[PDB]
Amino acid sequence: SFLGAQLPPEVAAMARLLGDLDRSTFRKLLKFVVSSLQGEDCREAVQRLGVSANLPEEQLGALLAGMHTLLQQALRLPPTSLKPDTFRDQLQELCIPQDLVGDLASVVFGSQRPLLDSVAQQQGAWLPHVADFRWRVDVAISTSALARSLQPSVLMQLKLSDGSAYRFEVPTAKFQELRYSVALVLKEMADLEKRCERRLQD
């Protein structure tokens, strides 16, 4: 099962609560789960839904926790690996009512999915990225130590997505090492991609 070898306790709890729940309330809750996955703050809207449904907060918490887990584990699977027929079968082993299964399936496979995939791909980053890169190229004509220098250098400034920024000067012997290193890594990324496509894809 896409839920792993042993059913998470929050999913088992939620699946027995669904028998008592009006489909109108289920579909209202499901929107909050999906929009929370896209990063939207929903806390006040959930509270209003609670008193509207007369759900105590102990049951809201169990329902919301169980729905989040089910969608998280399904949406992390590529379309090669979970497909509508096997998803629908596996959810029926949880004894989820068939009408609610259709609503869940529409979230995992319908037109909501591409925006969810975009948000899920953002979470692979762990180190910061280059946000900006600026330079100037200078030639030194004279200096305190030399009447004539005539030596080039590159002044560089990086801004990272961390919000950190660095300004530093690069000797041309050091720029050659940087340029070499970057082209080398690009060759070795391309070689690794060809290993993967010819051995891991089959």
Binding site: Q123, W126, S181, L184, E188, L192
Partner: protein
Amino acid sequence: MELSESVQKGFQMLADPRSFDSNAFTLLLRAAFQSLLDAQADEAVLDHPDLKHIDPVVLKHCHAAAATYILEAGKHRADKSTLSTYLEDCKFDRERIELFCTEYQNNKNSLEILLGSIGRSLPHITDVSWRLEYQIKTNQLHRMYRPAYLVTLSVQNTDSPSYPEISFSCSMEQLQDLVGKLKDASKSLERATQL
């Protein structure tokens, strides 16, 4: 629970039928709770037209006495038996003892939620995420071919200057060690439920 001589004299004046009738006692008592719990700093909270005959120095003294006893009774989790004992000591009559308990019981939950919201605490972990990578090469070393985990904890507290995420890396042995520690901790919560 101890109460200063200033607070006790304020209650001794609320106990009078002369100084306060049963109507004024109720209105001042309600104003006491309101001024504690309302977010509006209602400076006119004492300007009730039935309170207007009381000496404004006495009125404002008994209002602060009531509010001070309410906070002390709340903090010390006072039961009705404790409340009724202290009121009868201050010579309250059976009607006003009932009135004080009725207002206190109505507000008890709001007061206890307020008193419990005051404090500072450690940074609270709220979530975790992980990445699995296979390590290929370094500019100094080929054929590394070892997995690493990249773990981030999300913390959510502002009681002291802090940064919201803690990021670190684990080998297979380091992540297996870490998980064992957290399950050891979780097994101790289970034992504590057997108390």
